Amino acid sequence: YELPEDPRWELPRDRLVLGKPLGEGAFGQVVLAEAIGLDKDKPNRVTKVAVKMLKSDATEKDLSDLISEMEMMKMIGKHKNIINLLGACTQDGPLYVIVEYASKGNLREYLQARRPPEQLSSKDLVSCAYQVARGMEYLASKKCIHRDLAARNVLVTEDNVMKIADFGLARNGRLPVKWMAPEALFDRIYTHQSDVWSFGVLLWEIFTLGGSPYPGVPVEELFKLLKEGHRMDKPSNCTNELYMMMRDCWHAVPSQRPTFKQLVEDLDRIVALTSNQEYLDLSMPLD
Ligand SMILES: COc1cccc(/C(O)=C2\C=Nc3nccc(-c4cc(F)cc(F)c4)c32)c1
């Protein structure tokens, strides 16, 4: 109840028409809405957006977290492959943090909904991994460390653009552990390289059209598993190249893993060499 107005982002509270709830974050809830005259040069146009806000029983720390999240998004700056901040309503009423709307759910949902028997060419998947790596290297360049990268935290827009989400936060709602690198799992050491590992696992999710890592492997057992040096098996039909890529990401020594800069390169290359007519087969769709 002490928020300052930043005219660079402030949006008249009456220009926001709240609508269907898109769910609820952990530090609040998000609803779909239509923002009037958001272009500012086209004030008579509506723009579908996502508005994060606090619940009625929101603690003082929660608002603290929400404001903190908005300011980080301001710092980080825009980029095609991430969910971008569009405005905020901070005056005369509850705080509304307005960001981009992703009409096609998260990457996982998106993939599974596109399993055979629209579809996804073999290229669609690789270029898909390409965007996530861009968004990730951009954030990495902005000093930002995600700490929880996974298809579920990657949203898809009406134009099939991969946008990374919840990149401006800090602190087991969906069994995250399966995406954590060893040093991050055993010693809470998060870095850009540990985010690379999570990317490996996100590659796996992509070339299984939405599967869950370590299928059936008992969480408790997962621990010693990674220590012994075990890794998941190449996804069905996944190429040899892409499997090597994910193996590098899962390197035992975090310093020896690739970087998002490299990954973005390799993936840029690989996409240019992948057929747009090679539809994959999923006879045994795991998860
Ligand atoms: C950048 O980090 C943020 C900040 C604030 C909200 C979100 C967010 O998640 C969405 C942003 N656009 C969306 N379009 C459709 C569904 C969701 C969504 C909303 C939910 F509440 C849950 C969810 F899983 C997806 C979002 C992401």
PDB file of C-alpha atoms and ligand atoms in Angstrom:
ATOM      1  CA  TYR A   1       0.000   0.000   0.000  1.00  0.00           C
ATOM      2  CA  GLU A   2       3.039   2.211  -0.567  1.00  0.00           C
ATOM      3  CA  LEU A   3       3.728   1.794  -4.299  1.00  0.00           C
ATOM      4  CA  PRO A   4       5.412   4.522  -6.369  1.00  0.00           C
ATOM      5  CA  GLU A   5       4.245   5.165  -9.917  1.00  0.00           C
ATOM      6  CA  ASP A   6       6.714   4.462 -12.723  1.00  0.00           C
ATOM      7  CA  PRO A   7       5.140   6.162 -15.821  1.00  0.00           C
ATOM      8  CA  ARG A   8       7.322   3.961 -17.986  1.00  0.00           C
ATOM      9  CA  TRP A   9       5.101   0.989 -17.049  1.00  0.00           C
ATOM     10  CA  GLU A  10       1.989   2.326 -15.292  1.00  0.00           C
ATOM     11  CA  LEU A  11      -1.294   1.546 -17.007  1.00  0.00           C
ATOM     12  CA  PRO A  12      -4.671   3.052 -16.119  1.00  0.00           C
ATOM     13  CA  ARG A  13      -6.421   0.456 -13.926  1.00  0.00           C
ATOM     14  CA  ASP A  14      -9.618   1.030 -15.904  1.00  0.00           C
ATOM     15  CA  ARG A  15      -7.876   0.104 -19.166  1.00  0.00           C
ATOM     16  CA  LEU A  16      -7.472  -3.476 -17.942  1.00  0.00           C
ATOM     17  CA  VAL A  17     -10.444  -5.828 -18.377  1.00  0.00           C
ATOM     18  CA  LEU A  18      -9.855  -8.898 -16.200  1.00  0.00           C
ATOM     19  CA  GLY A  19     -11.114 -12.261 -17.463  1.00  0.00           C
ATOM     20  CA  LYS A  20     -10.739 -16.049 -17.192  1.00  0.00           C
ATOM     21  CA  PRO A  21      -8.230 -17.172 -14.571  1.00  0.00           C
ATOM     22  CA  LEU A  22      -5.153 -18.788 -16.150  1.00  0.00           C
ATOM     23  CA  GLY A  23      -4.415 -20.418 -12.868  1.00  0.00           C
ATOM     24  CA  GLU A  24      -2.386 -19.302  -9.928  1.00  0.00           C
ATOM     25  CA  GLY A  25       1.344 -18.966  -9.314  1.00  0.00           C
ATOM     26  CA  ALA A  26       2.825 -19.934  -5.951  1.00  0.00           C
ATOM     27  CA  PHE A  27       3.176 -16.322  -4.800  1.00  0.00           C
ATOM     28  CA  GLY A  28      -0.200 -15.307  -6.223  1.00  0.00           C
ATOM     29  CA  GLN A  29      -2.637 -15.928  -9.037  1.00  0.00           C
ATOM     30  CA  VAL A  30      -2.675 -15.102 -12.768  1.00  0.00           C
ATOM     31  CA  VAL A  31      -5.702 -14.295 -14.906  1.00  0.00           C
ATOM     32  CA  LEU A  32      -6.198 -13.668 -18.611  1.00  0.00           C
ATOM     33  CA  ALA A  33      -7.234 -10.106 -19.437  1.00  0.00           C
ATOM     34  CA  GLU A  34      -7.665  -7.633 -22.248  1.00  0.00           C
ATOM     35  CA  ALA A  35      -5.668  -4.415 -22.094  1.00  0.00           C
ATOM     36  CA  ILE A  36      -7.182  -1.428 -23.809  1.00  0.00           C
ATOM     37  CA  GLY A  37      -4.960   0.991 -25.663  1.00  0.00           C
ATOM     38  CA  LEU A  38      -1.730  -0.704 -24.642  1.00  0.00           C
ATOM     39  CA  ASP A  39      -0.022   0.354 -27.862  1.00  0.00           C
ATOM     40  CA  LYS A  40      -0.490   3.974 -26.735  1.00  0.00           C
ATOM     41  CA  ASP A  41      -0.420   4.916 -30.434  1.00  0.00           C
ATOM     42  CA  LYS A  42      -3.434   2.679 -30.984  1.00  0.00           C
ATOM     43  CA  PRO A  43      -5.476   3.351 -27.812  1.00  0.00           C
ATOM     44  CA  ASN A  44      -8.596   1.836 -29.388  1.00  0.00           C
ATOM     45  CA  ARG A  45      -7.136  -1.664 -29.652  1.00  0.00           C
ATOM     46  CA  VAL A  46      -7.369  -4.570 -27.243  1.00  0.00           C
ATOM     47  CA  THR A  47      -4.384  -6.813 -26.490  1.00  0.00           C
ATOM     48  CA  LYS A  48      -4.703 -10.191 -24.791  1.00  0.00           C
ATOM     49  CA  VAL A  49      -2.371 -10.269 -21.761  1.00  0.00           C
ATOM     50  CA  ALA A  50      -1.530 -12.169 -18.586  1.00  0.00           C
ATOM     51  CA  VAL A  51      -2.002 -10.328 -15.273  1.00  0.00           C
ATOM     52  CA  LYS A  52      -0.360 -11.624 -12.098  1.00  0.00           C
ATOM     53  CA  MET A  53      -1.809 -10.497  -8.772  1.00  0.00           C
ATOM     54  CA  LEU A  54      -2.141 -11.388  -5.086  1.00  0.00           C
ATOM     55  CA  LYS A  55      -4.874 -13.401  -3.397  1.00  0.00           C
ATOM     56  CA  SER A  56      -7.210 -11.840  -0.814  1.00  0.00           C
ATOM     57  CA  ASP A  57      -5.264 -13.570   1.989  1.00  0.00           C
ATOM     58  CA  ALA A  58      -1.939 -12.379   0.590  1.00  0.00           C
ATOM     59  CA  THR A  59       0.750 -11.950   3.226  1.00  0.00           C
ATOM     60  CA  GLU A  60       2.833  -8.762   3.422  1.00  0.00           C
ATOM     61  CA  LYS A  61       5.866 -10.708   2.183  1.00  0.00           C
ATOM     62  CA  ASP A  62       3.938 -11.919  -0.852  1.00  0.00           C
ATOM     63  CA  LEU A  63       3.334  -8.368  -2.094  1.00  0.00           C
ATOM     64  CA  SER A  64       6.994  -7.894  -1.270  1.00  0.00           C
ATOM     65  CA  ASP A  65       7.842 -10.783  -3.605  1.00  0.00           C
ATOM     66  CA  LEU A  66       5.497  -9.578  -6.320  1.00  0.00           C
ATOM     67  CA  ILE A  67       6.966  -6.103  -6.463  1.00  0.00           C
ATOM     68  CA  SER A  68      10.429  -7.596  -6.326  1.00  0.00           C
ATOM     69  CA  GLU A  69       9.583  -9.845  -9.275  1.00  0.00           C
ATOM     70  CA  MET A  70       8.333  -6.910 -11.348  1.00  0.00           C
ATOM     71  CA  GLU A  71      11.453  -4.837 -10.732  1.00  0.00           C
ATOM     72  CA  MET A  72      13.709  -7.735 -11.799  1.00  0.00           C
ATOM     73  CA  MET A  73      11.759  -8.076 -15.008  1.00  0.00           C
ATOM     74  CA  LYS A  74      12.315  -4.371 -15.580  1.00  0.00           C
ATOM     75  CA  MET A  75      16.057  -4.821 -15.077  1.00  0.00           C
ATOM     76  CA  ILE A  76      16.431  -7.920 -17.240  1.00  0.00           C
ATOM     77  CA  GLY A  77      14.923  -6.266 -20.303  1.00  0.00           C
ATOM     78  CA  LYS A  78      13.059  -7.602 -23.317  1.00  0.00           C
ATOM     79  CA  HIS A  79      13.750 -10.621 -25.501  1.00  0.00           C
ATOM     80  CA  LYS A  80      11.697 -12.711 -27.977  1.00  0.00           C
ATOM     81  CA  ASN A  81      12.257 -15.962 -26.040  1.00  0.00           C
ATOM     82  CA  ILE A  82      11.110 -14.980 -22.603  1.00  0.00           C
ATOM     83  CA  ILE A  83       7.877 -13.833 -21.009  1.00  0.00           C
ATOM     84  CA  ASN A  84       8.177 -10.015 -21.071  1.00  0.00           C
ATOM     85  CA  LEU A  85       6.719  -7.390 -18.740  1.00  0.00           C
ATOM     86  CA  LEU A  86       4.190  -5.156 -20.506  1.00  0.00           C
ATOM     87  CA  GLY A  87       2.971  -2.802 -17.782  1.00  0.00           C
ATOM     88  CA  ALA A  88       1.629  -2.569 -14.243  1.00  0.00           C
ATOM     89  CA  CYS A  89      -1.237  -1.058 -12.265  1.00  0.00           C
ATOM     90  CA  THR A  90       0.323   0.134  -9.030  1.00  0.00           C
ATOM     91  CA  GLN A  91      -1.947   3.040  -8.142  1.00  0.00           C
ATOM     92  CA  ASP A  92      -5.333   3.113  -6.374  1.00  0.00           C
ATOM     93  CA  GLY A  93      -5.925  -0.564  -5.886  1.00  0.00           C
ATOM     94  CA  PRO A  94      -4.231  -3.962  -5.866  1.00  0.00           C
ATOM     95  CA  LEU A  95      -0.918  -4.355  -7.750  1.00  0.00           C
ATOM     96  CA  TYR A  96      -1.306  -5.757 -11.254  1.00  0.00           C
ATOM     97  CA  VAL A  97       1.861  -6.980 -12.997  1.00  0.00           C
ATOM     98  CA  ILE A  98       1.031  -7.296 -16.727  1.00  0.00           C
ATOM     99  CA  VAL A  99       3.097  -9.687 -18.883  1.00  0.00           C
ATOM    100  CA  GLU A 100       2.829 -11.508 -22.183  1.00  0.00           C
ATOM    101  CA  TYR A 101       0.067 -14.027 -22.862  1.00  0.00           C
ATOM    102  CA  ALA A 102       0.918 -17.554 -24.057  1.00  0.00           C
ATOM    103  CA  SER A 103      -2.294 -18.995 -25.580  1.00  0.00           C
ATOM    104  CA  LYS A 104      -0.934 -22.541 -26.023  1.00  0.00           C
ATOM    105  CA  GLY A 105       0.083 -23.542 -22.498  1.00  0.00           C
ATOM    106  CA  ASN A 106       3.528 -24.712 -21.435  1.00  0.00           C
ATOM    107  CA  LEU A 107       5.934 -26.643 -23.611  1.00  0.00           C
ATOM    108  CA  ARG A 108       5.052 -30.007 -22.007  1.00  0.00           C
ATOM    109  CA  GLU A 109       1.331 -29.650 -22.558  1.00  0.00           C
ATOM    110  CA  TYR A 110       2.039 -28.376 -26.100  1.00  0.00           C
ATOM    111  CA  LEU A 111       4.200 -31.402 -26.977  1.00  0.00           C
ATOM    112  CA  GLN A 112       1.881 -34.088 -25.590  1.00  0.00           C
ATOM    113  CA  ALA A 113      -1.075 -32.531 -27.363  1.00  0.00           C
ATOM    114  CA  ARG A 114       0.908 -32.972 -30.566  1.00  0.00           C
ATOM    115  CA  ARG A 115       1.766 -36.649 -30.312  1.00  0.00           C
ATOM    116  CA  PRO A 116       0.741 -39.036 -33.145  1.00  0.00           C
ATOM    117  CA  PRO A 117      -1.520 -40.528 -34.356  1.00  0.00           C
ATOM    118  CA  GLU A 118      -1.499 -30.653 -35.961  1.00  0.00           C
ATOM    119  CA  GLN A 119       1.885 -32.393 -35.646  1.00  0.00           C
ATOM    120  CA  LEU A 120       5.535 -31.474 -35.212  1.00  0.00           C
ATOM    121  CA  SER A 121       8.244 -32.080 -37.772  1.00  0.00           C
ATOM    122  CA  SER A 122      11.607 -33.216 -36.561  1.00  0.00           C
ATOM    123  CA  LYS A 123      12.784 -29.645 -37.216  1.00  0.00           C
ATOM    124  CA  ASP A 124      10.006 -28.135 -35.104  1.00  0.00           C
ATOM    125  CA  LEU A 125      11.484 -29.844 -32.075  1.00  0.00           C
ATOM    126  CA  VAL A 126      15.045 -28.738 -32.671  1.00  0.00           C
ATOM    127  CA  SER A 127      14.163 -25.130 -33.460  1.00  0.00           C
ATOM    128  CA  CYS A 128      12.035 -25.412 -30.374  1.00  0.00           C
ATOM    129  CA  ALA A 129      15.088 -26.280 -28.334  1.00  0.00           C
ATOM    130  CA  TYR A 130      16.878 -23.457 -30.136  1.00  0.00           C
ATOM    131  CA  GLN A 131      14.538 -20.738 -28.824  1.00  0.00           C
ATOM    132  CA  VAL A 132      14.660 -22.002 -25.272  1.00  0.00           C
ATOM    133  CA  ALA A 133      18.435 -21.793 -25.464  1.00  0.00           C
ATOM    134  CA  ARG A 134      18.274 -18.237 -26.785  1.00  0.00           C
ATOM    135  CA  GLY A 135      16.008 -17.084 -23.973  1.00  0.00           C
ATOM    136  CA  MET A 136      18.342 -18.837 -21.633  1.00  0.00           C
ATOM    137  CA  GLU A 137      21.535 -17.298 -22.867  1.00  0.00           C
ATOM    138  CA  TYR A 138      19.940 -13.864 -22.873  1.00  0.00           C
ATOM    139  CA  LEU A 139      18.934 -14.313 -19.201  1.00  0.00           C
ATOM    140  CA  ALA A 140      22.342 -15.806 -18.502  1.00  0.00           C
ATOM    141  CA  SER A 141      23.926 -12.706 -20.054  1.00  0.00           C
ATOM    142  CA  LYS A 142      21.784 -10.528 -17.813  1.00  0.00           C
ATOM    143  CA  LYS A 143      23.316 -12.285 -14.798  1.00  0.00           C
ATOM    144  CA  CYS A 144      20.030 -14.114 -14.257  1.00  0.00           C
ATOM    145  CA  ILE A 145      20.086 -17.718 -12.952  1.00  0.00           C
ATOM    146  CA  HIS A 146      16.789 -19.586 -13.448  1.00  0.00           C
ATOM    147  CA  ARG A 147      17.212 -22.401 -10.895  1.00  0.00           C
ATOM    148  CA  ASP A 148      14.212 -24.327 -12.268  1.00  0.00           C
ATOM    149  CA  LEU A 149      14.239 -24.752 -16.026  1.00  0.00           C
ATOM    150  CA  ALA A 150      11.818 -27.294 -17.518  1.00  0.00           C
ATOM    151  CA  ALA A 151       9.251 -27.601 -20.268  1.00  0.00           C
ATOM    152  CA  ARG A 152       6.519 -26.716 -17.781  1.00  0.00           C
ATOM    153  CA  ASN A 153       8.265 -23.384 -17.152  1.00  0.00           C
ATOM    154  CA  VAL A 154       8.475 -22.685 -20.868  1.00  0.00           C
ATOM    155  CA  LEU A 155       5.333 -21.295 -22.455  1.00  0.00           C
ATOM    156  CA  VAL A 156       4.215 -21.282 -26.039  1.00  0.00           C
ATOM    157  CA  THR A 157       2.446 -18.429 -27.779  1.00  0.00           C
ATOM    158  CA  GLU A 158      -0.201 -18.329 -30.455  1.00  0.00           C
ATOM    159  CA  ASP A 159       2.764 -18.096 -32.857  1.00  0.00           C
ATOM    160  CA  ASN A 160       4.528 -21.077 -31.373  1.00  0.00           C
ATOM    161  CA  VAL A 161       7.252 -18.981 -29.866  1.00  0.00           C
ATOM    162  CA  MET A 162       9.079 -20.531 -26.929  1.00  0.00           C
ATOM    163  CA  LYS A 163       9.016 -18.106 -23.986  1.00  0.00           C
ATOM    164  CA  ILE A 164      10.800 -18.920 -20.719  1.00  0.00           C
ATOM    165  CA  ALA A 165       8.852 -18.187 -17.502  1.00  0.00           C
ATOM    166  CA  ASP A 166       9.423 -17.482 -13.783  1.00  0.00           C
ATOM    167  CA  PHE A 167      12.964 -16.402 -14.443  1.00  0.00           C
ATOM    168  CA  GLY A 168      12.783 -13.458 -12.036  1.00  0.00           C
ATOM    169  CA  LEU A 169      12.156 -15.319  -8.744  1.00  0.00           C
ATOM    170  CA  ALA A 170      13.995 -16.721  -5.682  1.00  0.00           C
ATOM    171  CA  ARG A 171      13.450 -18.869  -2.561  1.00  0.00           C
ATOM    172  CA  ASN A 172       8.218 -29.459  -5.029  1.00  0.00           C
ATOM    173  CA  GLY A 173       4.897 -28.563  -6.636  1.00  0.00           C
ATOM    174  CA  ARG A 174       5.695 -30.614  -9.755  1.00  0.00           C
ATOM    175  CA  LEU A 175       8.654 -32.860  -8.711  1.00  0.00           C
ATOM    176  CA  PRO A 176      11.485 -30.397  -9.701  1.00  0.00           C
ATOM    177  CA  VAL A 177      14.334 -32.528  -8.402  1.00  0.00           C
ATOM    178  CA  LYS A 178      14.479 -34.435 -11.707  1.00  0.00           C
ATOM    179  CA  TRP A 179      15.744 -31.269 -13.378  1.00  0.00           C
ATOM    180  CA  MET A 180      18.398 -30.384 -10.814  1.00  0.00           C
ATOM    181  CA  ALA A 181      22.058 -30.957 -11.508  1.00  0.00           C
ATOM    182  CA  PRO A 182      24.109 -32.961  -8.969  1.00  0.00           C
ATOM    183  CA  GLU A 183      25.899 -30.036  -7.251  1.00  0.00           C
ATOM    184  CA  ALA A 184      22.521 -28.287  -7.112  1.00  0.00           C
ATOM    185  CA  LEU A 185      20.804 -31.362  -5.739  1.00  0.00           C
ATOM    186  CA  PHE A 186      23.369 -32.316  -3.107  1.00  0.00           C
ATOM    187  CA  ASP A 187      24.744 -28.847  -2.195  1.00  0.00           C
ATOM    188  CA  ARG A 188      22.257 -26.231  -3.417  1.00  0.00           C
ATOM    189  CA  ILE A 189      24.863 -24.754  -5.760  1.00  0.00           C
ATOM    190  CA  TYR A 190      23.022 -22.993  -8.579  1.00  0.00           C
ATOM    191  CA  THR A 191      24.911 -21.504 -11.507  1.00  0.00           C
ATOM    192  CA  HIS A 192      24.530 -20.978 -15.207  1.00  0.00           C
ATOM    193  CA  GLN A 193      26.107 -24.379 -15.789  1.00  0.00           C
ATOM    194  CA  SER A 194      23.653 -26.080 -13.440  1.00  0.00           C
ATOM    195  CA  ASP A 195      20.976 -24.403 -15.564  1.00  0.00           C
ATOM    196  CA  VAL A 196      22.633 -26.008 -18.583  1.00  0.00           C
ATOM    197  CA  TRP A 197      22.089 -29.376 -17.005  1.00  0.00           C
ATOM    198  CA  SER A 198      18.409 -28.626 -16.542  1.00  0.00           C
ATOM    199  CA  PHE A 199      18.412 -27.748 -20.250  1.00  0.00           C
ATOM    200  CA  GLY A 200      19.729 -31.202 -21.029  1.00  0.00           C
ATOM    201  CA  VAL A 201      16.697 -32.668 -19.272  1.00  0.00           C
ATOM    202  CA  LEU A 202      14.507 -30.177 -21.128  1.00  0.00           C
ATOM    203  CA  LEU A 203      15.967 -31.598 -24.403  1.00  0.00           C
ATOM    204  CA  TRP A 204      14.998 -35.032 -23.247  1.00  0.00           C
ATOM    205  CA  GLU A 205      11.437 -33.811 -22.616  1.00  0.00           C
ATOM    206  CA  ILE A 206      11.362 -32.446 -26.149  1.00  0.00           C
ATOM    207  CA  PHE A 207      12.515 -35.549 -27.929  1.00  0.00           C
ATOM    208  CA  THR A 208       9.983 -37.685 -26.059  1.00  0.00           C
ATOM    209  CA  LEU A 209       7.221 -35.288 -26.920  1.00  0.00           C
ATOM    210  CA  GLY A 210       6.474 -34.427 -23.343  1.00  0.00           C
ATOM    211  CA  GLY A 211       7.731 -37.305 -21.249  1.00  0.00           C
ATOM    212  CA  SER A 212       8.910 -37.247 -17.626  1.00  0.00           C
ATOM    213  CA  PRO A 213      12.597 -37.730 -16.876  1.00  0.00           C
ATOM    214  CA  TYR A 214      13.848 -40.894 -15.155  1.00  0.00           C
ATOM    215  CA  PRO A 215      10.610 -42.763 -15.971  1.00  0.00           C
ATOM    216  CA  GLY A 216       9.692 -44.885 -12.953  1.00  0.00           C
ATOM    217  CA  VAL A 217      13.028 -44.220 -11.248  1.00  0.00           C
ATOM    218  CA  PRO A 218      12.291 -43.749  -7.511  1.00  0.00           C
ATOM    219  CA  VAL A 219      13.214 -40.216  -6.480  1.00  0.00           C
ATOM    220  CA  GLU A 220      15.159 -41.428  -3.448  1.00  0.00           C
ATOM    221  CA  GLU A 221      17.077 -43.802  -5.730  1.00  0.00           C
ATOM    222  CA  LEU A 222      17.770 -41.025  -8.223  1.00  0.00           C
ATOM    223  CA  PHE A 223      20.352 -39.592  -5.837  1.00  0.00           C
ATOM    224  CA  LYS A 224      23.002 -42.325  -5.776  1.00  0.00           C
ATOM    225  CA  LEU A 225      22.112 -42.952  -9.416  1.00  0.00           C
ATOM    226  CA  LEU A 226      23.591 -39.698 -10.757  1.00  0.00           C
ATOM    227  CA  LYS A 227      26.568 -40.139  -8.467  1.00  0.00           C
ATOM    228  CA  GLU A 228      27.351 -43.527 -10.051  1.00  0.00           C
ATOM    229  CA  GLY A 229      27.452 -41.676 -13.350  1.00  0.00           C
ATOM    230  CA  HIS A 230      24.179 -42.918 -14.791  1.00  0.00           C
ATOM    231  CA  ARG A 231      22.163 -40.777 -17.200  1.00  0.00           C
ATOM    232  CA  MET A 232      18.897 -41.263 -19.071  1.00  0.00           C
ATOM    233  CA  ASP A 233      18.912 -43.302 -22.276  1.00  0.00           C
ATOM    234  CA  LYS A 234      18.672 -41.726 -25.694  1.00  0.00           C
ATOM    235  CA  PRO A 235      15.015 -40.950 -26.425  1.00  0.00           C
ATOM    236  CA  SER A 236      13.458 -43.095 -29.147  1.00  0.00           C
ATOM    237  CA  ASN A 237      14.608 -41.990 -32.599  1.00  0.00           C
ATOM    238  CA  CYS A 238      16.398 -38.905 -31.115  1.00  0.00           C
ATOM    239  CA  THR A 239      19.499 -38.370 -33.216  1.00  0.00           C
ATOM    240  CA  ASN A 240      23.012 -39.220 -32.126  1.00  0.00           C
ATOM    241  CA  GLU A 241      24.039 -35.595 -32.268  1.00  0.00           C
ATOM    242  CA  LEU A 242      21.263 -34.299 -30.041  1.00  0.00           C
ATOM    243  CA  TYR A 243      21.855 -37.095 -27.596  1.00  0.00           C
ATOM    244  CA  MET A 244      25.523 -36.110 -27.339  1.00  0.00           C
ATOM    245  CA  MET A 245      24.427 -32.558 -26.711  1.00  0.00           C
ATOM    246  CA  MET A 246      22.281 -33.620 -23.769  1.00  0.00           C
ATOM    247  CA  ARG A 247      25.070 -35.787 -22.449  1.00  0.00           C
ATOM    248  CA  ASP A 248      27.457 -32.855 -22.463  1.00  0.00           C
ATOM    249  CA  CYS A 249      24.912 -30.783 -20.544  1.00  0.00           C
ATOM    250  CA  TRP A 250      24.857 -33.602 -17.988  1.00  0.00           C
ATOM    251  CA  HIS A 251      28.579 -33.562 -17.491  1.00  0.00           C
ATOM    252  CA  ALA A 252      29.707 -34.661 -14.048  1.00  0.00           C
ATOM    253  CA  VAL A 253      32.050 -31.637 -13.685  1.00  0.00           C
ATOM    254  CA  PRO A 254      29.993 -28.512 -14.013  1.00  0.00           C
ATOM    255  CA  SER A 255      32.892 -26.497 -15.485  1.00  0.00           C
ATOM    256  CA  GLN A 256      33.147 -29.019 -18.307  1.00  0.00           C
ATOM    257  CA  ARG A 257      29.574 -28.547 -19.484  1.00  0.00           C
ATOM    258  CA  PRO A 258      28.749 -26.443 -22.551  1.00  0.00           C
ATOM    259  CA  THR A 259      27.320 -22.925 -22.273  1.00  0.00           C
ATOM    260  CA  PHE A 260      24.128 -21.479 -23.589  1.00  0.00           C
ATOM    261  CA  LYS A 261      26.231 -19.535 -26.111  1.00  0.00           C
ATOM    262  CA  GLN A 262      27.606 -22.784 -27.555  1.00  0.00           C
ATOM    263  CA  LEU A 263      24.266 -24.609 -27.367  1.00  0.00           C
ATOM    264  CA  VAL A 264      22.618 -21.715 -29.204  1.00  0.00           C
ATOM    265  CA  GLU A 265      25.298 -22.098 -31.859  1.00  0.00           C
ATOM    266  CA  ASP A 266      25.162 -25.833 -32.301  1.00  0.00           C
ATOM    267  CA  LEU A 267      21.368 -25.767 -32.247  1.00  0.00           C
ATOM    268  CA  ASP A 268      21.380 -22.997 -34.854  1.00  0.00           C
ATOM    269  CA  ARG A 269      23.415 -25.265 -37.073  1.00  0.00           C
ATOM    270  CA  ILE A 270      21.459 -28.408 -36.360  1.00  0.00           C
ATOM    271  CA  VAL A 271      18.159 -26.728 -37.126  1.00  0.00           C
ATOM    272  CA  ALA A 272      19.450 -25.682 -40.592  1.00  0.00           C
ATOM    273  CA  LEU A 273      20.247 -29.316 -41.282  1.00  0.00           C
ATOM    274  CA  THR A 274      16.958 -30.894 -40.103  1.00  0.00           C
ATOM    275  CA  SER A 275      14.047 -31.876 -42.390  1.00  0.00           C
ATOM    276  CA  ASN A 276      10.717 -30.121 -42.062  1.00  0.00           C
ATOM    277  CA  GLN A 277       9.021 -33.266 -43.330  1.00  0.00           C
ATOM    278  CA  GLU A 278      10.387 -35.829 -40.882  1.00  0.00           C
ATOM    279  CA  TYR A 279       7.496 -36.539 -38.519  1.00  0.00           C
ATOM    280  CA  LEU A 280       8.563 -38.645 -35.488  1.00  0.00           C
ATOM    281  CA  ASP A 281       6.756 -41.797 -34.274  1.00  0.00           C
ATOM    282  CA  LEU A 282       5.531 -42.425 -30.730  1.00  0.00           C
ATOM    283  CA  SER A 283       4.276 -45.999 -30.371  1.00  0.00           C
ATOM    284  CA  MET A 284       5.176 -46.133 -26.680  1.00  0.00           C
ATOM    285  CA  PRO A 285       4.293 -42.666 -25.333  1.00  0.00           C
ATOM    286  CA  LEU A 286       5.818 -42.570 -21.847  1.00  0.00           C
ATOM    287  CA  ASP A 287       3.882 -40.380 -19.396  1.00  0.00           C
TER     288      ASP A 287
HETATM  289  C1  LIG B   1       7.434 -14.430 -16.579  1.00  0.00           C
HETATM  290  O1  LIG B   1       6.962 -15.152 -15.438  1.00  0.00           O
HETATM  291  C2  LIG B   1       5.613 -15.051 -15.279  1.00  0.00           C
HETATM  292  C3  LIG B   1       5.067 -14.013 -14.530  1.00  0.00           C
HETATM  293  C4  LIG B   1       3.688 -13.942 -14.335  1.00  0.00           C
HETATM  294  C5  LIG B   1       2.857 -14.908 -14.893  1.00  0.00           C
HETATM  295  C6  LIG B   1       3.402 -15.948 -15.644  1.00  0.00           C
HETATM  296  C7  LIG B   1       2.486 -16.988 -16.294  1.00  0.00           C
HETATM  297  O2  LIG B   1       2.322 -18.084 -15.759  1.00  0.00           O
HETATM  298  C8  LIG B   1       1.841 -16.670 -17.645  1.00  0.00           C
HETATM  299  C9  LIG B   1       2.223 -15.658 -18.415  1.00  0.00           C
HETATM  300  N1  LIG B   1       1.532 -15.712 -19.551  1.00  0.00           N
HETATM  301  C10 LIG B   1       0.699 -16.750 -19.523  1.00  0.00           C
HETATM  302  N2  LIG B   1      -0.179 -17.206 -20.429  1.00  0.00           N
HETATM  303  C11 LIG B   1      -0.919 -18.278 -20.205  1.00  0.00           C
HETATM  304  C12 LIG B   1      -0.813 -18.968 -19.001  1.00  0.00           C
HETATM  305  C13 LIG B   1       0.080 -18.526 -18.029  1.00  0.00           C
HETATM  306  C14 LIG B   1       0.094 -19.182 -16.800  1.00  0.00           C
HETATM  307  C15 LIG B   1      -0.432 -18.575 -15.661  1.00  0.00           C
HETATM  308  C16 LIG B   1      -0.443 -19.252 -14.444  1.00  0.00           C
HETATM  309  F1  LIG B   1      -0.962 -18.693 -13.335  1.00  0.00           F
HETATM  310  C17 LIG B   1       0.071 -20.541 -14.355  1.00  0.00           C
HETATM  311  C18 LIG B   1       0.592 -21.148 -15.490  1.00  0.00           C
HETATM  312  F2  LIG B   1       1.072 -22.402 -15.391  1.00  0.00           F
HETATM  313  C19 LIG B   1       0.608 -20.472 -16.708  1.00  0.00           C
HETATM  314  C20 LIG B   1       0.855 -17.402 -18.302  1.00  0.00           C
HETATM  315  C21 LIG B   1       4.778 -16.019 -15.836  1.00  0.00           C
END
